[PDB]
Amino acid sequence: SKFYKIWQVFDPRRVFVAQGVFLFLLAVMIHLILLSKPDYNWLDVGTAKYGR
Amino acid sequence: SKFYKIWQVFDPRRVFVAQGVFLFLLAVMIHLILLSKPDYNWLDVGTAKYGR
Amino acid sequence: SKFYKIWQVFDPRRVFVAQGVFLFLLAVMIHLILLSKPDYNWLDVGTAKYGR
Amino acid sequence: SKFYKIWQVFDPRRVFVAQGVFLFLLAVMIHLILLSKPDYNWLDVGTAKYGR
Amino acid sequence: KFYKIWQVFDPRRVFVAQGVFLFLLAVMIHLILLSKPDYNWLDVGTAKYGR
Amino acid sequence: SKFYKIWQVFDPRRVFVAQGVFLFLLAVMIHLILLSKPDYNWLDVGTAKYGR
Amino acid sequence: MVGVNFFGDFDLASLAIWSFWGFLAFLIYYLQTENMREGYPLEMEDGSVAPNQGLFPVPKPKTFKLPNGRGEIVMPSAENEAAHRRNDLALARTSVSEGFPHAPTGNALVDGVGPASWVPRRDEPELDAHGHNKIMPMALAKGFNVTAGRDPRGLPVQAADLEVVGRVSELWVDVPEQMVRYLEIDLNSGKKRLVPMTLAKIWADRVRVNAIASDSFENIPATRSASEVTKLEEDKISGYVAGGWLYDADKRKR
Amino acid sequence: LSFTGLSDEQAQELHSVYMSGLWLFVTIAVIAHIAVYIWRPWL
Amino acid sequence: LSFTGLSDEQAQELHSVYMSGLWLFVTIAVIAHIAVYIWRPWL
Amino acid sequence: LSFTGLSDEQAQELHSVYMSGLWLFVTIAVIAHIAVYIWRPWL
Amino acid sequence: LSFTGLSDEQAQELHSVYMSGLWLFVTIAVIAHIAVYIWRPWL
Amino acid sequence: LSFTGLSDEQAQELHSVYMSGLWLFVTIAVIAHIAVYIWRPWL
Amino acid sequence: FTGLSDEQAQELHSVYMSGLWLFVTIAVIAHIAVYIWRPWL
Amino acid sequence: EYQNIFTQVQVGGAPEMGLVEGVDLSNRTKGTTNWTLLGWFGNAQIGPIYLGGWGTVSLISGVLWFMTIGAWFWYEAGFNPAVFMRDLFYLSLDAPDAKYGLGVPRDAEGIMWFIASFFMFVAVWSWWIRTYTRAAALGMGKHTAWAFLSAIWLWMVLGFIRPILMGSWSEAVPYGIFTHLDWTNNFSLTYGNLFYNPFHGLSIAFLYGSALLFAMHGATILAVSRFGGDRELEQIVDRGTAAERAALFWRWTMGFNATMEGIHRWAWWFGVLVTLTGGIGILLSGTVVDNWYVWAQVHGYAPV
Amino acid sequence: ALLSFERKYRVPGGTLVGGNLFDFWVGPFYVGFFGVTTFFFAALGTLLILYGTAMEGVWNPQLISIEPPSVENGLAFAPLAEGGLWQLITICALGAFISWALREVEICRKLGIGLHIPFAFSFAILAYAVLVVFRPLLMGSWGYAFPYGIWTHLDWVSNTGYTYGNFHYNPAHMLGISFFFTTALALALHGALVLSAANPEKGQEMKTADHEDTFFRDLVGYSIGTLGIHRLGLLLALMAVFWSAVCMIITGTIWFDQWSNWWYWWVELPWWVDIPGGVNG
Numbered sequence A, B, C, D, F: 001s002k003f004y005k006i007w008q009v010f011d012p013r014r015v016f017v018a019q020g021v022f023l024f025l026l027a028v029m030i031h032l033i034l035l036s037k038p039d040y041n042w043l044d045v046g047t048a049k050y051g052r
Numbered sequence E: 001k002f003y004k005i006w007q008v009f010d011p012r013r014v015f016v017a018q019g020v021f022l023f024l025l026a027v028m029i030h031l032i033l034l035s036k037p038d039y040n041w042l043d044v045g046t047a048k049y050g051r
Numbered sequence G: 001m002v003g004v005n006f007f008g009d010f011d012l013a014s015l016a017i018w019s020f021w022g023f024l025a026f027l028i029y030y031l032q033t034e035n036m037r038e039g040y041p042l043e044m045e046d047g048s049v050a051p052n053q054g055l056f057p058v059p060k061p062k063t064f065k066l067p068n069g070r071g072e073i074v075m076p077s078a079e080n081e082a083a084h085r086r087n088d089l090a091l092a093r094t095s096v097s098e099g100f101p102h103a104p105t106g107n108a109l110v111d112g113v114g115p116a117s118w119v120p121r122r123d124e125p126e127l128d129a130h131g132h133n134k135i136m137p138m139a140l141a142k143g144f145n146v147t148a149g150r151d152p153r154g155l156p157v158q159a160a161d162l163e164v165v166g167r168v169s170e171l172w173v174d175v176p177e178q179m180v181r182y183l184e185i186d187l188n189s190g191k192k193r194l195v196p197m198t199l200a201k202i203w204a205d206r207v208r209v210n211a212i213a214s215d216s217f218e219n220i221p222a223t224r225s226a227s228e229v230t231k232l233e234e235d236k237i238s239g240y241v242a243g244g245w246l247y248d249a250d251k252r253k254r
Numbered sequence H, I, J, K, L: 001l002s003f004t005g006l007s008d009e010q011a012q013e014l015h016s017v018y019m020s021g022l023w024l025f026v027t028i029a030v031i032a033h034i035a036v037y038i039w040r041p042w043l
Numbered sequence M: 001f002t003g004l005s006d007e008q009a010q011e012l013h014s015v016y017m018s019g020l021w022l023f024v025t026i027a028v029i030a031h032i033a034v035y036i037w038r039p040w041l
Numbered sequence N: 001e002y003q004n005i006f007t008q009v010q011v012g013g014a015p016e017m018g019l020v021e022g023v024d025l026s027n028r029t030k031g032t033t034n035w036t037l038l039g040w041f042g043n044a045q046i047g048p049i050y051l052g053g054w055g056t057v058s059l060i061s062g063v064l065w066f067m068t069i070g071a072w073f074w075y076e077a078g079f080n081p082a083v084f085m086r087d088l089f090y091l092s093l094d095a096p097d098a099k100y101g102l103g104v105p106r107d108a109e110g111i112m113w114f115i116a117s118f119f120m121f122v123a124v125w126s127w128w129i130r131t132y133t134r135a136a137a138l139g140m141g142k143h144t145a146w147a148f149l150s151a152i153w154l155w156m157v158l159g160f161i162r163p164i165l166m167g168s169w170s171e172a173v174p175y176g177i178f179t180h181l182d183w184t185n186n187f188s189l190t191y192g193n194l195f196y197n198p199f200h201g202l203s204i205a206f207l208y209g210s211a212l213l214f215a216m217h218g219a220t221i222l223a224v225s226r227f228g229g230d231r232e233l234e235q236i237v238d239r240g241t242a243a244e245r246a247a248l249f250w251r252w253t254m255g256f257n258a259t260m261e262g263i264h265r266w267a268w269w270f271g272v273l274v275t276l277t278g279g280i281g282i283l284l285s286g287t288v289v290d291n292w293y294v295w296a297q298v299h300g301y302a303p304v
Numbered sequence O: 001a002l003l004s005f006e007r008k009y010r011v012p013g014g015t016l017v018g019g020n021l022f023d024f025w026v027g028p029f030y031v032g033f034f035g036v037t038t039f040f041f042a043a044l045g046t047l048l049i050l051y052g053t054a055m056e057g058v059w060n061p062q063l064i065s066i067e068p069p070s071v072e073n074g075l076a077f078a079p080l081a082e083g084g085l086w087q088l089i090t091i092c093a094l095g096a097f098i099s100w101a102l103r104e105v106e107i108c109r110k111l112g113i114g115l116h117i118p119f120a121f122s123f124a125i126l127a128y129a130v131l132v133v134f135r136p137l138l139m140g141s142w143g144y145a146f147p148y149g150i151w152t153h154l155d156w157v158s159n160t161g162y163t164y165g166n167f168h169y170n171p172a173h174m175l176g177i178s179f180f181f182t183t184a185l186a187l188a189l190h191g192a193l194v195l196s197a198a199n200p201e202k203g204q205e206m207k208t209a210d211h212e213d214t215f216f217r218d219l220v221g222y223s224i225g226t227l228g229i230h231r232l233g234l235l236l237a238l239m240a241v242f243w244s245a246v247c248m249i250i251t252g253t254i255w256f257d258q259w260s261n262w263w264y265w266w267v268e269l270p271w272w273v274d275i276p277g278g279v280n281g
């Protein structure tokens, strides 16, 4: 509950932009691992579900 | 919610620029992922659909 | 709307030239995309249409 | 209709350089492209027409 | 008296170092698990559920 | 016995970080060497303890 | 255009390589003539003008229009060479033949000969674009602070004979370049004297100057101004100091 | 406090216009994903 | 008020002009995309 | 004191509205993960 | 208003001559494209 | 002080909060570990 | 050489040694634990 | 005994923002930085850049180029990040198939190559114009642009011209880290042994000569830095013992010398002639000469 | 023979060996002990090249080639007609180069300037030696060195590089390349910058270091400084030649196969080997 203090230690601008890049890269990497695996490729699974 | 203060955190011009490049690059990433998959290719599909 | 405030944060020069570059390059990119396709290639199309 | 204010932004002696450069590049691109096509290559099609 | 470390080291440096280190560690462990057919969770799941 | 001034000798800050790096690296390498040996690989031993 | 010889075996490739030989000849001419703007006409040891003035002719004069209203400089020219011409040279011919040395008659570090030679650059200082002096002492250079490294100020100045002569006082800096050119000394003899940073090696406990010994630190040329330093004084100082690698070697120890 | 120095009210109007454009873009993208789902689904 | 230093009048009119041009552009784009779909549908 | 120079109050207000944000992110994440578990169970 | 050191009189004269030239260039281009359509149509 | 010049007591506070965070982290981790051994054990 | 350890050299070293101790006890427990399960010598 | 390789003492001050000589100050930035890791070997100020129109053109086009190649890298990698970071060097945006000739390739790899190349074209030419303009605004000479134009000449010869003369975009270079090396090798092997391309030999001569010359010049100017030889512009106009000593070193050594301006003239040519001769020697490969070892035999620098 | 300022520097001294004996000039040239040595060695090597091609009967300067002994000769001295000439010419060339360096030293200390130049030259001598002295010794035979022919050392390069496939995959070679390219680049930039300052647009005044720094800060956001660029180009050349010597001394002594197979240690790391995707799957 004392966690609010950190911003007295960091400049929230730097924290925020680094946070953003972190999140975006993580997303693209997780999504990509999934696309790569034949199962979990929502596109191939869909095309199989609707038989296209 | 009082998110507006993020504009008190960092500047609008630079965040706007980054936002623009990010969105365009993402749009392109996705459109290309689609074009690569045989189905979801708006062009070859329309060619199948209309003859030619 | 108050979109007209964007010119209080962006300078006409940078934005104008960026938009020009972006649009022209996008046009060229999409035209080449099409011409790579035996379909939608207006040259080859009008070739087959007039039987030449 | 008030487009004439563009020249309150851009010093025209550079805009004219850029414009002429762009136009020559484009003319060359399209001319060449057509020359890459036996159907639109004027020299060869004339050769064949007149029968030389 | 482990509180005395904060006088030797700077918290700004420790947070930006520990964080990156722990992230790296987690990524490495996860990858080592994935490299093994067993412990590759995505793979295991597909077979158990019949997909 | 008289080991109190190892710090008068060495600036505490650099020494601690170097110690940390060294220990982490050494652990990583020993674990790697163990996982390298099929006999000593803990994950593989689990593959024997449970039939999976 | 394969297998197309205009005559003999000569095709576009041969024509191009030969054209290149020609262009290259003209280019060597051009460059070895533009390397003549300083130093020519060729002299004898007598100061005369010699018969062999080279096989390449001296080129036609150009003009350098200087910033800050310092005038026009014409190279090649007689004014250019005559300004930078040294006179009253303490030298003695070693032989009537040419191609032999000329010995220093007196003290060379002072007489300005040999490695200790200097050139009469103009007693106006070096300027930035704004026209302010290039070299300011760090105290007049507003905003200038040591951003790193060993701050030498106050360190003793060991010399080539291993003896000590004084303590550093101030740093003279290239403000537009943000670097330290000269360092000043508060000498034991009560005098201030400059020494180039490139000739002084900052140790942790001291500044070492292996160029010259201690007897020399006192006879170093001075500055008519303590806030500025001209190109002339710079050349005099730098030559004097650098000459110690030859003319104070019997004194250098370690 | 305000590293950028933008006032509280200037910031509020900035966020208003920003989110206006944002919601516009988002609902357009919604229109788009709907039309796609209709011609070809993917889930 | 402005990071650029401009006024609300100058910005208002600048935006009006830029958007008139944008509308002309988008207009021709729609015209052409429609003529195309009629020429060779891509959907 | 504060390496940042941030006020003590400033710190609490920044962490609070920041936490609202982290929390929004987490809640959308949970909704999404749960949704996917039904469509495909990864475990 | 003006970032390029020009005034309305100057700029209106300038746009006048510029658009004169532009219409002329477009004119010859149109003529050419029409002659070519007659010669070899691409559609 | 000798190095950082961190005020004592505040340094102790820093130690407290840091430790709370560490405990939080380790707990989440162990819970996750136990979750897994039961799902797929290793020992 | 640091010149700040004239007094607390004792403190620094002692706490460092305490940390060392915690680490080493954990290590020894770990070594005992592994040896029974798989013995390496 | 101080050789002046690493700076001993650093100093600094308020950043040197610039010199207003006709530059548009609004297209310039106002933020600087100090990073002493460089101060040891150079100036530490990562100073203000100029953000202009041509610069924006270049940045946009070249970033599209980069990210395009990365996109094809991903597709070629199965979207598996580990494959990407595995085959990163072995991947390639290979060049179009010869079937297409100089027409717009009717494949994906091919048209992606074509587009990436369009982007590179835009970027490079924009940057050349940016050099010209930055040297025209500060009122300086355009030597930097005419030097870059030499590099552009080679780069064009390889991507645009030589193929147009040969009738195939297949001839152009792939965008990879190992595939463009393979391209160079296969280019030599197809056309004789490129060594026997006299213009190749000349470009080599001038590359080695550029290294020779810069080592010479740099070692000299550090040797005479104790007399302020580093300040060159002022030794062209106000000659001092630095220039005299350097000139006389080279005279007494090899019989000829230069001046503090003419050595700069020598450098500008050894540099550009590396890519002027290369461009020609590459043009002539396959258009004028299908094999260079035989041309040599016929021309007398290779034996029968 | 003198320049308008060559006199006050023509003083005695600055001699590592010798003294009055040999402290004189011949035309523009300074000739000390080491000048005499380098002249002797150079002349001898030249005349031996000519006699070698005379014995061969070749007189075309491009087809003249003096080749090293066979590889079977091993590291012994051979007949002059089968390698002895190459060997003597190598001896003389090395003596000549080292003497050139030491002459440069004598001159640098007579003119009171630093010894950076002979240092730079030493790296080149080191590489030449790596090629004709060291690498052989470690490879067992003089015949692995290169010949003294304008167009034949190129054949040696080609064959030696194709022994290990595409030499391009040698990493030290990569670094040599990179530093060479960057060297030419920086050379052109320096020259152009300086000439553009001194020789600006017509009707404008001479420029200064401030304008150079500003132009390159404008262009790429960083300027290295008037001293830093010299430092830099020097180090670039040296590290290039350093990497180039490192690339060759390890080619046939520590490595023996195609150089491509080296980078396959990154592929073959167990956690991305089996992955079926990309080039290596």
Ligand SMILES: CCCCCCCCCCCCCCCCCC(=O)OC[C@H](COP(=O)([O-])OCC(O)COP(=O)([O-])OC[C@@H](COC(=O)CCCCCCCCCCCCCCCCC)OC(=O)CCCCCCCCCCCCCCCCC)OC(=O)CCCCCCCCCCCCCCCCC
Pocket: G016, G017, G018, G019, G020, G022, G023, G026, G027, G030, N140, N141, N142, N143, N146, N147, N149, N150, N153, N265, N272, N276, N280, O195, O199, O200, O201, O202
């Ligand atoms: C059978 C044949 C026999 C043999 C025939 C042999 C005949 C020999 C005749 C004599 C030729 C000697 C040429 C060398 C003299 C240059 C001396 C020098 O360093 O400075 C002079 C001096 C420099 O002035 P400065 O001291 O810097 O200060 C002047 C201002 O105050 C302040 O300066 P600024 O900023 O206003 O201007 C600076 C510029 C002063 O100059 C200029 O401002 C103009 C420079 C020329 C620029 C280009 C002209 C515009 C049109 C270009 C078209 C390009 C098409 C591509 C697209 C467009 C790109 C823009 O400074 C220079 O250094 C100019 C020299 C530049 C030479 C070209 C370098 C780039 C070429 C790269 C290759 C690209 C083309 C492909 C080549 C291969 C083709 C197969 O300028 C002059 O004396 C007049 C300029 C000369 C005009 C160009 C003519 C020579 C070009 C030769 C290029 C090599 C050709 C290949 C050889 C053949 C191979 C087969």
Ligand code: BCL
Pocket: N062, N123, N124, N151, N152, N154, N155, N158, N183, N184, N185, N187, N188, N194, N195, N197, N199, N200, N203, N204, N205, N207, N274, N275, N277, N278, N279, N281, N282, O157, O181
């Ligand atoms: C085994 C294969 C063949 C061979 C095949 C080729 C081929 C093929 C070529 C040469 C070429 C060259 N070779 Mg090789 N080469 C061989 C043997 C050698 C040997 C040797 C010792 O054996 C040497 C020293 C050389 C020497 C050379 C150079 C002299 C020359 C290229 C110079 C240059 O600057 O290129 C590099 C220069 C450029 C490409 C300039 C490009 C500049 C542009 C503007 C870059 C754009 C930047 C971009 C946007 C990136 C942005 C970066 C970020 C902003 C940071 N080669 C072997 C025998 N070589 C070239 C040449 O001239 O052919 C005669 C060439 O094309």
Ligand SMILES: COC(C)(C)C/C=C/C(C)=C/C=C/C(C)=C/C=C/C(C)=C/C=C/C=C(C)/C=C\C=C(\C)CC/C=C(\C)CCC=C(C)C
Pocket: E001, E002, E003, E004, E005, E006, E007, E008, F026, F029, F030, M008, M011, M012, M015, M016, M017, M018, M019, M020, M021, M023
């Ligand atoms: C890899 O395996 C092979 C086969 C090679 C076999 C092994 C080979 C070798 C050579 C192995 C070598 C192992 C070594 C050298 C191990 C050494 C281990 C040691 C010495 C560990 C010591 C750890 C000590 C610790 C962690 C002490 C303290 C911990 C802290 C967190 C510091 C806290 C201190 C504070 C707060 C300082 C107080 C500050 C003030 C101002 C009062």
Ligand SMILES: COC(C)(C)C/C=C/C(C)=C/C=C/C(C)=C/C=C/C(C)=C/C=C\C=C(C)\C=C\C=C(/C)CC/C=C(\C)CCC=C(C)C
Pocket: D029, N066, N067, N069, N070, N071, N073, N074, N114, N117, N118, N120, N121, N155, N156, N158, N159, N160, N172, N173, N174, N175, N176, N177, N180
């Ligand atoms: C991390 O992953 C992401 C996706 C986020 C980003 C990663 C990006 C990556 C990995 C990028 C990698 C890029 C690489 C490896 C680039 C390498 C390029 C190389 C080595 C190029 C070498 C030579 C290229 C040459 C010589 C190309 C010349 C091309 C031209 C001269 C173009 C001329 C014009 C052409 C071909 C036709 C078009 C003309 C007109 C007028 C339209």
Ligand SMILES: COC(C)(C)C\C=C/C(C)=C/C=C/C(C)=C/C=C/C(C)=C/C=C/C=C(C)/C=C/C=C(\C)CC/C=C(\C)CCC=C(C)C
Pocket: A002, A003, A004, A005, A006, A007, A008, A009, E011, E018, E028, E029, F024, F027, F028, F031, F032, J001, J002, L010, L014, L017, L018, L021, L022, L025
């Ligand atoms: C499996 O085999 C291999 C070899 C792969 C790996 C095996 C074993 C290895 C190498 C294991 C290594 C384990 C290690 C080294 C674990 C270390 C864990 C630690 C030290 C974790 C610490 C976590 C700390 C956290 C999460 C702290 C958070 C603190 C905060 C959020 C507080 C921030 C706010 C503050 C301080 C308020 C600001 C204060 C003031 C006064 C203004």
